[PDB]
Design a protein around this ligand. Structure first.
Ligand SMILES: [K+]
Ligand SMILES: [Mg+2]
Ligand SMILES: [Mg+2]
Ligand SMILES: [Mg+2]
Ligand SMILES: [Mg+2]
Ligand SMILES: [Mg+2]
Ligand SMILES: [Mg+2]
Ligand SMILES: [Mg+2]
Ligand SMILES: [Mg+2]
Ligand SMILES: [Mg+2]
Ligand SMILES: [Mg+2]
Lengths: 213, 98, 86, 25, 61, 130
RNA sequence: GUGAAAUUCUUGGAUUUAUGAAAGACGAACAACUGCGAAAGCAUUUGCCAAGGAUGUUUUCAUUAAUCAAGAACGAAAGUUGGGGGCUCGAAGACGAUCAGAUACCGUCCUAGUCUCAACCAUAAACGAUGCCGACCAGGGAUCGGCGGAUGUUGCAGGACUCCGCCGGCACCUUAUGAGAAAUCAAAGUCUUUGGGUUCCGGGGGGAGUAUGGUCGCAAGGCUGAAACUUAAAGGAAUUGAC
């Protein structure tokens, strides 16, 4: 807010559609407060609706991480994908079965991350039962299917494809239709992703997923 | 004199049920006995939605909802008019209003 | 269906006892039977219990016939079923 | 008078009597 | 100083019933509808002055 | 530039005692203007009143024009945690004045901290008796 | 923080915002007139270990059974002995506030405790205020587990759904022709037209679950448990007023 500070602009990764993401501040050069080190904010919450210019995906949230500050830009990278409280609170309904699964899969880039999936039983078109529950011996099989599908689509090439299958519902739809032999399982997708560990900066692989700025 | 057949709670076929805390006084009440409600409301009300519509950057932004399950002890529920005292014959009426 | 005043306990309807519990019938009777399962090929004479509990085999290829379940043994789709009686 | 507090008073009397009796054995 | 015309009267409210809660719209901007309270006698079709146009109200105060 | 909106984040924190309007950078590690409802009133009871939040929102609107903050992301929250979770009385007016004081609003979310299962709430087992 | 304030924190930066690590406790929403267990009680995932009800059975033994003095297992919370842990909350204590007074209700800081391991205690409105086993006697729909049949849809024999039936369970609704002092109860019915089996247990209200003895416990205490004296009522259900 002072007469000092510099107006930097963030750069979303090339994987999305729009790279311009707001503006940010930093102390210019005062003493030991280096601008390069001070701009390692490393967390930016966006909606993924702006990054795709489509409004129906506003329920999502993308956590970007500032990796390297260069050329008055910040050059962020993926650091997480979560949900807004609105969608999660809207989904959980009474007279229903909630199934939650989670795994700790690992990618080739040594990006240890944790994935969470959430699912709900679906009533049939001709249903007079007012509850639509499931037996625990069935929800356990659903959870096993969720975990095995998660570790099947993961454990593959770099995270680029992993987020390429996150902004669409590829894991969620695959789990949905791989469990129809047990229950219909409506509204299935990845609740949130937590990055447990990053390998290193690696000094250059970030520029392979960024444009010319 | 037994005022209610179920004793004022909803316990059958079990001996113990964990409690909750009333949202107004923080008094421990059994989960089945507590008066539970689910309130769903707009973040901004009708007087506010008009002024927030044009203030929104894009017209495609649907206004967000908020959902809250609240629990009340009998004293707080009665004092807050969540549930009134009913007549002896109307006490058995478990039908929700409308 | 006023009450048993119209029906006769001695001579009750012959179909209503097809649905009561076996113990609760006028005379207790089993609900099971024996069937001579015929495979797709030869060796079609093997006799098995309806509510079987052991996974029976066939001399030819062991031709697994039935799986024991909570009730009637799960005959395979390939094995043909006909019943023998007294 | 609440019977709970009457029971508490009785317990206090009992322990005081026990102490008095232990004094003289 | 945003003159408003009383649009409907929502019955006398308050401890003594002295305040009367009404709905008004601005003469500068007809389409904006607010709720306020007024002392004294008020009938529909009247024009009422004010000082602060941002204060809101509640139904059946 | 003009038209295209520079976005800040308003961390409205409306309890039953105060009302914080805190505008930060997208990261949240910066701070543009942080004013509570208690700054604009001379009695520590009226801090949570809607009019104090109205005044504080007017001041944040005045401050956030000189730096080019042309739109806000609102993250409304309440006490949260193990305590009360509904937003305070001043939550709406503080928002409403933002709309009225020529300020653009982006996404509106609720970020009240909810526990999956909290520690013991204060007051005792019998609760706060009046 | 409060109806309102103060005790307390704070320009050495309190409150607030973002990131990260650690610690202990706790398992929201899903969660129900739903499930399991002898009761107390039991709610994140996964693996292991033994156990259990119900269902199915043209498997087996053949009265092996029901209830039980004595005698035993288990038994919320608080409490006791040590070791660890010690986030939050919080008996005792202190302070602020209200008040004629406030050793209380309202605020804040907190000790034992709240968590866990190895031992003790043996009590609760431990309640369905309703011991266990067996037979019969109205109807109805819903629901949980298993099984039998029919049925025609699923981005998929079987699973999900629909319909009928049987056994077992938690309950619910209507009505006595039943019972009851009544509230009410489908069992609290089949009772002067009194008898299916068996265990425990009450004899007007106090004194009193007190005294003492016995006995278990480190203790707090538990089990067993009177008498003198006093009293004409105490009490249950419903009714009309008054508040
Ligand atoms: K209730
Ligand atoms: Mg099923
Ligand atoms: Mg009463
Ligand atoms: Mg049971
Ligand atoms: Mg109990
Ligand atoms: Mg949970
Ligand atoms: Mg269940
Ligand atoms: Mg004994
Ligand atoms: Mg007892
Ligand atoms: Mg069934
Ligand atoms: Mg007597």
């Amino acid at each position: 807010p002072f007469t000092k500070k510099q107006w930097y602009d963030i750069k979303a990764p090339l994987l999305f559609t729009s790279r311009n993401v707001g503006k940010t501040l930093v102390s210019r050069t005062q003493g030991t407060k280096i601008a390069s080190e001070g701009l390692k904010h490393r967390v930016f919450e966006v909606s993924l609706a702006d990054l795709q210019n489509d409004e129906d995906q506003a329920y999502r949230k993308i956590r970007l991480r500032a990796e390297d500050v260069q050329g008055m830009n910040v050059l962020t990278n993926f650091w997480g994908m979560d949900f807004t409280t609105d969608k999660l609170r809207s989904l959980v309904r009474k007279w229903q079965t909630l199934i939650e699964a989670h795994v700790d899969v690992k990618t080739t880039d040594n990006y240890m991350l944790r994935m969470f999936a959430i699912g709900f039983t679906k009533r049939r078109p001709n249903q007079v039962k007012r509850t639509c529950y499931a037996q625990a011996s069935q929800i356990r099989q659903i959870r096993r299917k969720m975990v095995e599908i998660m570790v099947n689509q993961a454990a593959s090439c770099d995270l680029k494809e992993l987020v390429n299958k996150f902004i669409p519902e590829v894991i969620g739809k695959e789990i949905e239709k791989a469990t129809s032999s047990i229950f219909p399982l409506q509204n299935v997708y990845v609740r949130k992703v937590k990055i447990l560990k990053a390998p290193k900066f690696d000094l250059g692989k970030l520029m392979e997923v960024h444009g010319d700025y | 004199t037994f005022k209610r057949r179920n004793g004022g709670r909803n316990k059958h076929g079990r001996g113990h049920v964990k409690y909750i805390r009333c949202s107004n006084c923080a008094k421990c009440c059994p989960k089945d006995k507590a008066i539970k409600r689910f309130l769903v409301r707009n973040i901004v009300e009708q007087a506010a939605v008009r002024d927030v519509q044009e203030a929104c950057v894009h017209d495609g932004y649907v206004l967000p909802k908020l959902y809250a399950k609240v629990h009340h002890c009998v004293s707080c529920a009665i004092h807050a008019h969540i549930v009134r005292v009913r007549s002896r014959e109307n006490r058995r009426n478990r039908e929700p209003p409308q | 269906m006023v009450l048993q005043n119209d029906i006769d306990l001695l001579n009750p309807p012959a179909e209503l006892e097809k649905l009561k519990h076996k113990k609760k019938r006028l005379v207790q009777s089993p609900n099971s039977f024996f069937m001579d399962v015929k495979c797709q090929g030869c060796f079609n004479i093997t006799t098995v219990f309806s509510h079987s509990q052991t996974v029976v085999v066939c001399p030819g290829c062991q031709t697994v016939l039935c799986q024991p379940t909570g009730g009637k043994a799960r005959l395979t789709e390939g094995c043909s079923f006909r019943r023998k009686g007294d | 008078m609440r019977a709970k507090w009457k029971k508490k008073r009785m317990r206090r009397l009992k322990r005081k009597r026990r102490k008095m009796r232990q004094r003289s054995k | 100083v945003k003159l408003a015309v009383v649009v409907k009267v929502m019955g006398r409210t308050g401890s003594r019933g002295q305040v009367t809660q009404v709905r008004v719209k601005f003469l500068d901007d007809q389409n904006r509808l607010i709720m306020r309270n007024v002392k004294g006698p008020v009938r529909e079709g009247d024009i009422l002055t004010l000082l602060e146009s941002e204060r809101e109200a509640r139904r059946l105060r | 530039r003009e038209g295209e909106h520079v976005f800040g984040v308003a961390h409205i924190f409306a309890s039953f005692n105060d009302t914080f309007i805190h505008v930060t950078d997208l990261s949240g590690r910066e701070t543009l203007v942080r004013i509570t409802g208690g700054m604009k009133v001379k009695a520590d009871r009226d801090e949570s009143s809607p009019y104090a939040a109205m005044l504080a929102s007017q001041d944040v609107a005045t401050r956030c024009k000189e730096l080019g903050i042309t739109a806000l992301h609102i993250k409304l929250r309440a006490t949260g945690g193990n305590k009360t979770k509904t937003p305070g009385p001043g939550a709406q007016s503080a928002l409403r004045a933002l709309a009225r004081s020529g300020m653009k609003i982006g996404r509106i979310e609720d970020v009240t901290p909810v526990p999956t299962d909290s520690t013991r709430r204060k007051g005792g087992r019998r609760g706060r008796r009046l």
